Design a protein around this ligand. Structure first.
Ligand SMILES: C[C@H](CCC(=O)NCCC[N+](C)(C)C[C@H](O)CS(=O)(=O)O)[C@H]1CC[C@H]2[C@@H]3[C@H](O)C[C@@H]4C[C@H](O)CC[C@]4(C)[C@H]3C[C@H](O)[C@]12C
Ligand SMILES: Nc1ncnc2c1ncn2[C@@H]1O[C@H](COP(=O)(O)OP(=O)(O)O)[C@@H](O)[C@H]1O
Ligand SMILES: [Mg+2]
Length: 265
């Protein structure tokens, strides 16, 4: 049933979930992976299929930007991800997981659930700002709207995207800046939580939702604690043109790095 499954996914975290999928079946969505393995490589828009997605709604039944991705995979990967998460649990930049085994049809399929991710990961912001195409920019309108950079009528302007006819677009993009900068800070906590726990892995962009949290421990192998390494070659590098389109460091010219406080003199 898709109702006992929902009442399991809600868990102990008192959240009210509307299934974006349909009937305990995975929701196939078109996303922006950054991937390298023995067959494929690149920063490309693939199509992910292994994740049931439920959206949480607040009081008065309004949908907020907070989802519950419930990725289902093999039992061995579930066990490995459970031990890696129980090492990295104490970190604050790690989205809260929930590991359960549920009767899907006649068998216990192991689901690992991730709580309160946003809709689009950082790779979707970076891909939609790096691979711009003004006919088809719908994961940039939705990111700009849903994080209050503009107000969904800004796109009724004739050329809202144009840096030379509409220079005000820079003020729009800079309103993403503090959402990006906090993301950077959360990475440096997560990298630290890897280094002090002895976990070796590759930080990709698409494993970080736009709040900042990190949520994929599939190919992290653990070594002796105090000596793990994070590999952030292709995290910081793909992200790099976004750190000045969106002016991510203009909260650093303010005293004690708070956007409310006055400038440093
Ligand atoms: C340069 C970097 C580290 C060099 C080093 O000196 N490590 C010290 C730790 C020793 N170990 C191998 C254990 C290299 C070598 C070892 C790592 C790759 C391995 O395929 C294992 C790893 C786990 C998954 O299963 C498959 C992929 C992973 C993520 C790869 C990523 C990357 O390419 C790493 C971090
Ligand atoms: N064929 C598959 N079906 C489902 N899950 C898989 C498959 N191959 C790998 N995985 C697991 O999913 C991860 C990649 O899934 P992905 O689509 O990136 O979702 P997420 O970003 O949540 O990991 C890998 O780390 C691995 O643990
Ligand atoms: Mg992943």
């Amino acid at each position: 049933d898709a109702q006992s499954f929902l009442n399991r996914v809600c868990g102990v975290s008192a959240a009210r979930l509307t299934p974006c999928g349909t009937g305990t079946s995975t929701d196939v969505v078109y996303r922006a992976f950054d991937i390298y393995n023995d067959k494929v490589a690149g920063f490309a828009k693939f199509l992910k299929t292994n994740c049931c997605r439920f959206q949480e709604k607040d009081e008065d039944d309004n949908l907020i930007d907070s989802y519950f991705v419930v990725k289902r995979h093999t039992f061995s990967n579930y066990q490995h991800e459970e031990t890696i998460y129980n090492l990295l649990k104490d970190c604050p930049a790690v989205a809260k997981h929930d590991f359960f085994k549920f009767r899907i049809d006649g068998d216990m399929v192991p689901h690992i659930s991730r709580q309160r991710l946003t809709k689009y990961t950082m790779a979707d912001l970076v891909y939609a700002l790096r691979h711009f195409d003004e006919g088809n920019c719908d994961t940039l309108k939705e990111i700009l709207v849903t994080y209050n950079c503009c107000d969904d009528d800004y796109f009724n302007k004739k050329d809202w995207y144009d840096f030379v006819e509409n220079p005000d677009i820079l003020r729009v993009y800079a309103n993403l800046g503090e959402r990006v900068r906090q993301a950077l800070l959360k990475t440096v906590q997560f990298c630290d939580a890897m280094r002090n726990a002895g976990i070796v892995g590759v930080l990709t962009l698409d494993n970080q939702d736009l709040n900042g949290n990190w949520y994929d421990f599939g190919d992290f192998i653990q070594t002796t604690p105090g000596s793990g390494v994070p590999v952030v070659d292709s995290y910081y590098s793909l992200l790099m043109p976004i750190l000045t389109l969106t002016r991510a460091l203009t909260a650093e010219s303010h005293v004690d790095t708070d956007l409310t406080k006055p400038y440093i003199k």
